[PDB]
Amino acid sequence: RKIIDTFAVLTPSAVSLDMRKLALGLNDDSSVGENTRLKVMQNCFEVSNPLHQLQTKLTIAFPDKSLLQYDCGKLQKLAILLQQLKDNGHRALIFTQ
């Protein structure tokens, strides 16, 4: 789970919704019976798959959390100096506007 979460980035930039249902042959109007298609969607509803994590990761690009310190130039060079002061046993004061 950790590797998949960390290393899944790309998304299918071009998509066409409602094409999935047409491709699977199930929708409001088709050549299949209403009861049969209803049973098919019920089964798909109650069938569990282990790929849901990857499905969500690829479908939407979650901003995650570690990007907070990566999008700021000051934050990039601040953690290193904080760690350096930590190893030397020095306390720090921060002033903001």
User: For binding to other proteins (CB under 8 A), which residues are involved?
Assistant: 2-4, 6-17, 19-26, 28-32, 36, 38, 40-42, 44-45, 47-52, 54-56, 58-60, 62, 66, 70, 76
| Nearest C-alpha neighbor of 56 from the set 3, 11, 7 | 11
| Residue placing its CB nearer to other proteins in the complex, 59 or 85 | 59
Of residues 16 and 95, the one with the C-beta less far from other proteins: 16
Of 65, 55, 44, 52, nearest to 12 by C-alpha is 55
CA distance 64 to 56: 13
Nearest residue (CB) to other proteins, 74 versus 93: 74
